[PDB]
Design a protein around this ligand. Structure first.
Ligand SMILES: Cc1cc(OCC2(CONC(=N)N)CC2)cc(OS(=O)(=O)c2ccccc2S(C)(=O)=O)c1
Lengths: 11, 26, 249
């Protein structure tokens, strides 16, 4: 459902 | 200090579609 | 939000989304009260009866959003928390009394059309406005039914008399909450629902035309059940703790 966010953020 | 003043409404003097319902209740 | 409509773009620019990193999922709503502080419901972060206990690194705050699921490129900003403060006397064991927490952003967010803090209330705004009959506005991306919206939802709800809030439930009500909602007879509906917790209840002052946040979406039984009401953390009663936290850290 959720669109993947920039991995810069998931760091 | 600018708090609670919306760029796209109060700042332009635009009302949203339902805010009158709030104010009419006060 | 049950029986609300789609928000207008820019309509709630303080509305923040609490977002789990993995699984990537909407945790809660929340609000932008400065460029570095977000205010939410403490039970969003810490609720032992459900083995819920998130920390700073469990979480992302997304600000500027309108769409629930899209990543809104050039519009939203996603930040990490530096610190999380839960009220020392939040009461999760019994009635969610003092359901309030502050989150410190790791770096300050910049304001734009879509991102702007709400005001926190002073004594005499609180006195003037927190009255039965006065409507406030709740917003969120939670369920539509006790399924989920594409776009931020909004609804306007009247404050309900203290005695009426007490006879609507078995749970012990305290001076740190108030309840909002239509009586079964008034023939209008609306309520927060799962996923809306932590969200802003706000009111526009007629005196200066600013939007103040008087409530945090806290608790309620079912969603939009007749004869039941939503309950909101009473933000002014707990501003003393807020001021403290903010100007200590
Ligand atoms: C955390 C939470 C949120 C909640 O509501 C979540 C909401 C907001 O409130 N609900 C509504 N306004 N409809 C997002 C929907 C409802 C909850 O259960 S309880 O209230 O019965 C409640 C309240 C206090 C103590 C015990 C219980 S209980 C009966 O154990 O589950 C609990």
């Amino acid at each position: 459902d959720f669109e993947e966010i920039p991995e810069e953020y998931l760091q | 200090a600018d708090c609670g003043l919306r760029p796209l409404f109060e700042k332009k003097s635009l009302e949203d579609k339902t805010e009158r319902e709030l104010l009419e209740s006060y | 939000i049950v029986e609300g409509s789609d928000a207008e773009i820019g309509m709630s620019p303080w509305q923040v989304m609490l977002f789990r990193k993995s699984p990537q999922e909407l945790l809660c709503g929340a609000s932008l009260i400065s460029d570095r502080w977000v205010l939410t419901a403490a039970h969003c972060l810490l609720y032992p009866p459900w083995d819920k206990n998130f920390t700073e690194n469990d979480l992302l705050v997304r600000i500027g959003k309108h769409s629930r699921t899209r990543y809104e490129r050039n519009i939203e900003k996603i930040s990490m928390l530096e610190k999380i403060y839960i009220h020392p006397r939040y009461n999760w064991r019994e009635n969610l009394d003092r359901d309030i927490a502050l989150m410190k952003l790791k770096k300050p967010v910049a304001f734009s059309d879509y991102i702007h803090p709400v005001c926190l209330p002073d004594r005499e705004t609180a006195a003037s406005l927190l009255q039965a009959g006065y409507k406030g506005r709740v917003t969120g991306w939670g369920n539509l039914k006790e399924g989920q919206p594409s776009v931020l939802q909004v609804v306007n709800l009247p404050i309900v008399e203290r005695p009426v809030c007490k006879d609507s439930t078995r749970i012990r009500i305290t001076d740190n909450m108030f309840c909002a909602g239509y009586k079964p007879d008034e023939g209008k509906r609306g309520d927060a629902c799962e996923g809306d917790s932590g969200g802003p209840f706000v009111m526009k002052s007629p005196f200066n035309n600013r939007w103040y946040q008087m409530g945090i979406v806290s608790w309620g039984e079912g969603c939009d059940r007749d004869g039941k009401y939503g309950f909101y953390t009473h933000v002014f009663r707990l501003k003393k703790w807020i001021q403290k936290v903010i100007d200590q850290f």
